[PDB]
Ligand binder design. Sequence first.
Ligand SMILES: [Cl-]
Lengths: 243, 240, 250, 195, 244, 235, 231, 111, 241
Amino acid sequence: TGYDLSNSVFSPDGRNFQVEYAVKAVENGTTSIGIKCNDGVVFAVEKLITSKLLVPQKNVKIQVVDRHIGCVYSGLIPDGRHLVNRGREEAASFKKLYKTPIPIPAFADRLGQYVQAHTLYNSVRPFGVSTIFGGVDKNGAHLYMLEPSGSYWGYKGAATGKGRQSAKAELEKLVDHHPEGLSAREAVKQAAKIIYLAHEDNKEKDFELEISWCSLSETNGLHKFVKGDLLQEAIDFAQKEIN
Amino acid sequence: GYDRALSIFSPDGHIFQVEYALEAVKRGTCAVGVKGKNCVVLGCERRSTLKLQDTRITPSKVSKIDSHVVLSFSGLNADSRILIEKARVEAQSHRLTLEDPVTVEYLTRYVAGVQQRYTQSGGVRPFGVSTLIAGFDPRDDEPKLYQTEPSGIYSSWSAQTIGRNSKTVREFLEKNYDRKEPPATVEECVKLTVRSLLEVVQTGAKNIEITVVKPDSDIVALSSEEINQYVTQIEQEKQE
Amino acid sequence: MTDRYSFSLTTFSPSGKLGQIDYALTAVKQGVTSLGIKATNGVVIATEKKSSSPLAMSETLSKVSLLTPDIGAVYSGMGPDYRVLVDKSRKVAHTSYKRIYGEYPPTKLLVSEVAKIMQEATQSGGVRPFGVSLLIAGHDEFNGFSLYQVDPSGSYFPWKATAIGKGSVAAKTFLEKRWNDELELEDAIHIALLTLKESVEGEFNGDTIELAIIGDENPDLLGYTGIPTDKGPRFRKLTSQEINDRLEAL
Amino acid sequence: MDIILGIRVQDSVILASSKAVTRGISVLKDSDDKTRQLSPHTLMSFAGEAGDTVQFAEYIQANIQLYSIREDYELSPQAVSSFVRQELAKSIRSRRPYQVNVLIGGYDKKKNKPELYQIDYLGTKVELPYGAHGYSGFYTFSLLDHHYRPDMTTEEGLDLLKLCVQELEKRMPMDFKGVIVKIVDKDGIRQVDDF
Amino acid sequence: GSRRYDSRTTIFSPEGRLYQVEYALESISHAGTAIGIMASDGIVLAAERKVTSTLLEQDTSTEKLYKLNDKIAVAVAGLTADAEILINTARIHAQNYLKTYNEDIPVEILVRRLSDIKQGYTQHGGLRPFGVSFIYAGYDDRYGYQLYTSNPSGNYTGWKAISVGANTSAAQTLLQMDYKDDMKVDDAIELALKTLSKTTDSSALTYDRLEFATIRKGANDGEVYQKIFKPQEIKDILVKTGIT
Amino acid sequence: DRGVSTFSPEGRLFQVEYSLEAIKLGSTAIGIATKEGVVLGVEKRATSPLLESDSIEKIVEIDRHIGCAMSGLTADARSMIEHARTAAVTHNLYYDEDINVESLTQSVCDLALRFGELMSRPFGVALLIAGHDADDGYQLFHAEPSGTFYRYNAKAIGSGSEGAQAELLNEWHSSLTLKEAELLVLKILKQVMEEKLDENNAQLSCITKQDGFKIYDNEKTAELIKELKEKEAAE
Amino acid sequence: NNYDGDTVTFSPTGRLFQVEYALEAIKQGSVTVGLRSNTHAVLVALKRNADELSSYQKKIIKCDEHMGLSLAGLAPDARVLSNYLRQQCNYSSLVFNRKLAVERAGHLLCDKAQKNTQSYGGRPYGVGLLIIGYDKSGAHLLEFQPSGNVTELYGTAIGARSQGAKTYLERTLDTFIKIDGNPDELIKAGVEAISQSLRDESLTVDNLSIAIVGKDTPFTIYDGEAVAKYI
Amino acid sequence: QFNPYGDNGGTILGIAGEDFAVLAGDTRNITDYSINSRYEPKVFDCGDNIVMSANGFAADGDALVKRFKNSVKWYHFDHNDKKLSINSAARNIQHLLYSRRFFPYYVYNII
Amino acid sequence: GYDRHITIFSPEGRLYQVEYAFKATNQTNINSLAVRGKDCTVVISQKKVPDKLLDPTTVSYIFCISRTIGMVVNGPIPDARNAALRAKAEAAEFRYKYGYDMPCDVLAKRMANLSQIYTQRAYMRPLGVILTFVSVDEELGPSIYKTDPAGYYVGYKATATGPKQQEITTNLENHFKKSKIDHINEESWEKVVEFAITHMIDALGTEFSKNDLEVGVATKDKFFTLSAENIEERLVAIAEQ
Ligand SMILES: [Cl-]
């Protein structure tokens, strides 16, 4: 034993226990989700209200990369911010050299290679976040989810954090009941519902809902936050479904 | 580069590497320094476990840093060469930038600073060496004798000893050396230095080295026969 | 990141042993047998092509390697370590010699350079020793034919004949009885094949044996004509057919 | 400083060096000693660009003094001259070369022979019976070619040196304010205070 | 991080010893014995090759005795590969000195340089020390014939006669017994071989298990010659001295 | 082993806490601040009678308006003093004025936590920095290897520190004269010292606006010791 | 236990113990309170002394004319982080002629602290910070933890016994947020808040430290007899 | 060839009274024979009761003033809000200017 | 026992970190196969999409390294992509420097040399992957070269990698023992793919749908992967005889 004391050490299983321990920090975090719709993607996250003293709508968690990519994560919030800062550098240098905005699959690998690099040495700690991200490019909508190991795949729907099982079950229903697809405005409504349903795992403290979206028709392929009437409409739809 | 912090504090507030460096000094051959009224004498032990030695070419224990300053030591021999070289370079660097030779105090302060630096620098261990630095400042007839140690602390001494069985010879010096009246001549100063080493040395043959430093860059090393005459006279007075 | 292993991984133990070198020698012991014999008019080096799978094409894996036109090498131990050493040995022959003197290095000096590289992996920071022992055969004008062994420590010794790896102890005894100072190259090849048969279990033919010689100049292998002083490489790898021909007179 | 001479006689080396230092159109000093003792039996005179001369000389002096202390031994004049040459040959291809010409007069205690080395700022070394730098040789070498013997005494060497200085004082346009003369022999280095 | 795996090669023991230096010396004590004897008219270097084979090419072999320049040579005891690293450095230092001062390097200055390199590996860098002890045999016009030794600690000392490697305790006693100051080279040759013959772990001392060298002013008039003995010449001197 | 910049479970840096233990072994140093000046005094503690005590320099001048006393591994203080003197003179170069005592102290303390795997370990010495400037008058600071510095009306550091600090608690008031402070340092030093206090094994110093930083002669201190003995025998 | 030797090591439950130990240093530190209305933002800090002869350690640091913080934990670490803020505020002014937004200042502190938690050799910061400021979107209050977590709040407190002041602010939320255009009453509410964290000791003239920033009020610190008004 | 320097003209005047001081300057900014601006401030309040004007090449002038203003700000941070005296500001400016001894601020400055 | 944590020798002369990297290779539980035709080289690999939420089009362990070279990986995807990106960079750099397309066996050697370095240098860990490179080389023809974490590489007539590699290996061995040739004697690549799938079915004893497989084909001057519908056409032909 001692194989779990140092990062980048293979156990006799062929496992990197330090990465597996990073996953535990992700599982400890708040629930975040992603839904791929007809011409875009929707992101949503659970924000735990620790105290009345928290200013509503101020501590924003979802982050934009470039102008067409949205990123949300569960786990160690600072680690997620660090990963997005890198993502923004990667997207900038891509656009600098190649002119066009970075494609989503291209962007996914840039994050993937960076996170994977933090599993190669004992001088660095793996990332304590699973990141759900995506957007709209020339080939259409893409949704991805990236783990501490550097592993990522494309998704129809994605979920991570403490209420991930509950969320995953809800996403699987949507995939089955909508083979033709889901509209962007529907996806926002459904996203709200799923976060509310996933809140049963964090039921001690009440929470604040935060949603964002990129859609070719609804937002011109740009990342935007869901605000005001459209946010309230989604909250009402969510509250109606839990009762 | 290798950056590892080797010299570090322990729970009881000790830097063990610096303290273990002092143990290397304890192992080294005895060295003694005595300052008279118009001179300083540096005595050094030579362990007689090594015969078939070529004494012409074997590194001598007392080293000239400049024409007016000398340095003897106890501890690791290889370590002492590095300090001596740095000191010799600094001595010429001082003459070059300030147009005066170093004072004995300044040279000591430099060597002590080097030793200290090696107690809080990454990747390096402390020097396993304590030094006795002696001489006369330019255009000054007051004798100077200083001591340094691995930690980097230094101080001036009327008389001092370092190395193995230094506890015994310091005992001798403390009762035999009078501050109100120090050894007035060269003879008296050398005699007291040889006497102090005879408490520890074994045979008074090729085991004792003596170096006399007088004012105005007057430095000479005594030969075997000259020292042997002191050894003879001391024991003949002792038979009484 | 940064390589933060700036300290030695090979150190003296209380008994005076360098553990990692000893262990590297143990890895060499497990390795497949290879040998070298020196004749009056040439040198031969040989080893078994231990194929990992019958689906693998063992011709693509070269255990015997040309270092210069007149110098060849073979190993026992870890193959990947050997491969990178051959790459470095070929390059160092140019950088530290040919690009200076305009000619290929003599056997002993190239060996010296390979040895240096192996010694540095025994002392430098954050690296293990190479897990191979090399046998280097070669010829040069002023020293004639020669054969050298190079160990993980970087130590190298000249041999009349020797063997390394799995069945080295038995093979060295076999060579002591057969070797003399009047051997012709063909006689040395014959002895090499006899010696190598003892350590091989399975098939013993041109396709499972890899054998090269340092002998006469091969103008047919030079690739060009017109310069009298250039007469071609002395290193030549024996074909599968050439080996089998000598196995009938065995 | 422009003028430095050297002559090797039977048992000593004699170096003569001007006393003048000029800034702009004004002579600032008429008693300047353009020489440094490198070791007890080795003297180096110098001439070249302002500043570089003293900085180089003192730098060499420091290095030879360091060697002496380290080994408790005096380097031969030949060894010192080779060290000096290498420093100048190194210097000439630097970003900003040291523009200094030197004469090295030493007495080799091993061979019991005086030795005179002439080295210019490029690192061009030659051992000579007599030497000079700049234009000094143009005026003086014809006299030295005529009068010089290898068995000359120190007193004869000084007389021939006086004749050289007189010729310089007659035919040179520049007033160099006389010379400081120094003798290097088996007993070391001493200055001739009346010349 | 990486700290976990650091052996810390440059630290003191509680007793004030350098662990790695002491263990390196333990390694050297198993190496073949090398002897140096200094006489009035020259120096002898004798050394024992370690358990050889009949198939080792001896005439082109060199593991013990190495030439640093025309005036200085060394006998090796320890890791040969380590020694060659240092030897090439020493050869370069000699040539640097010659280029700078246009004079052959004094023996002690070369020795001090190599010993300072060894010292550095015990105080900084975190690397293992060189597992080598040298005997330096050399000549210059200041001190004449000189013998020195250096060990992994970087400490060096001068000698009239000295041994390194295996059985130095026994060897040093035998040398101390028969050595005299007015001794000559031919006598020293005999002493060196007799000492090896008694201290050797082998059954008998033969030509194929020895390397031998002399530094003589036995060169035509005031100059010094190095002689690295050939296998046949070692065989002849063994018969001459009456060992075989 | 373990990192040099490691936190303990209590939220303290191991190495900093251990260096504080080294300072407890050091010789006693005391500082008292008054409206007439600041007094600094130290125990010399010679290890042998042959050691020329006047070469023990545990009180040091940083500038004409700033002095400094030390306790602990005194060799470590040399580079701190060098930095302090450089900072003090450099500020005078840049701004044509004396540097504030606090600003000087802050500059010294900035070195403290520059250790890791920069220097390999914290300093093993504490400093009493005393001085005067026009803005905040006479000041006394205690500079630790933690990088923290407190201002004090009076402070003791070293082996007899907690015993001396309790004594300084009772004796200090805002109307102390310089002469009263001098005797008070001598009194408390004499109380905590192993050997008997005299002019050779103890040293006094002060900083005033008029005369600046001054180390006291052995003859001057000897009289103040004699004056102390008589006033204690007076009741 | 086995996983607290350095910051580069996760525990089996996904915890970073060196970060948690740094968080502990804050709890040992003296109490400090932060609260704001729509016009002003206030810091109140209980300063700590070594003894009766010593001074009271300063707790509040100015970063710009419109921004500053209070500290709790290792004071040297607060100096390093405040110096970084001073530079960043200053870079924004010199390059963009733009006062640095308080929210962006929080994001910068977060990212600086994070780098010290993922790399070998270094250590996390051992201090907690309460940043107040007034920018183009009005008054702000931030709480910084050396884990990297930065949070925007109406009011809060950190340090020893900070839970008492935090509960008080949670009750008073609806009252003090409405204190607009009245700096003295907002400070009163802050002084009354920090009083809920006191035991044995009370607020004296050299004990109390207050800072304020607002609409037409540059960041100014009050110490000594300037706070006797509020005792 | 690129010429990094220019001349923006202008003229400034400083006079010290018994208990007051004035620093005046025209508001005209020019290049060659053209007027850039008829009102471009050239004399600035730098805080701590100090006024400055760096006349000559406006880009170097603006840069210097900007750096000194910054120097005053950091003087407050580093030395407990101490007021920067006029003599101290002067010496500080000397070091700001000599930093570019080998690529000078082409301005003539007065405070 | 720190000789098991970093890449240094154990007393037995073993590198345990290398051996454990081999074990990580089978973590995906996927089996791959490669065979050579007359004009082509075919590689097939199992495809497993366990989660319904996944976009199955993005789940792949076959990579297009250059236009001529394809690579299939056995091991975790992060290391797989790490190796893929590096191989793509190396292939492009080779073309730029030396003026011709990097051969399959040369790239294999280069990646193997990189793998060797990780086994010798302590600060770098081995990648837990086995890389199978395929092409139709302009000099050597149809080519299969495979690299592992030990830094070992060799050419192959055919090969198989994964948990059940031995079953597939023996199945292929037995076929080539009959035919007595080093390749699949077939004109079209379509039939060589059908051979590859058929013999994987026989060896593993499992049937495949279009979504259970992943196929890569190398021809002269291009390497390409097959779509689900291309594979379906292949599966239909197999069933109809
Ligand atoms: Cl390569």
